[PDB]
Amino acid sequence: YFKIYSKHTPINLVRDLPQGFSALEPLVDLPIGINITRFQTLLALH
Amino acid sequence: LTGTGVLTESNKKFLPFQQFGRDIADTTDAVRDPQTLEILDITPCSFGGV
Numbered sequence: 001y002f003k004i005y006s007k008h009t010p011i012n013l014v015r016d017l018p019q020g021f022s023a024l025e026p027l028v029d030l031p032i033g034i035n036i037t038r039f040q041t042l043l044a045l046h
Numbered sequence: 047l048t049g050t051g052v053l054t055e056s057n058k059k060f061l062p063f064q065q066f067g068r069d070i071a072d073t074t075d076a077v078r079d080p081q082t083l084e085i086l087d088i089t090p091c092s093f094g095g096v
Contacts, residue, residue, distance in 0.1 A: 025063060
């Protein structure tokens, strides 16, 4: 089961993570049933 | 899940993923109805030592 927990907050400090406590709620849980050893991130490029 | 208790409207807020309330000792404080999504508080039926 792939579980994704997502929290969205406005961030004052562009450079680094703000010190603070944020609780992440699970958006959805999906039965993908696939083994994952690596991940990559897609960025749209102008 | 089987239990015996009075069912009442539940004041406590539940996030959408959350389905069951938790009591101190492995019993369900609150349940959300499966058919219609409203939180119900569970209180054990009145018992008094005599």
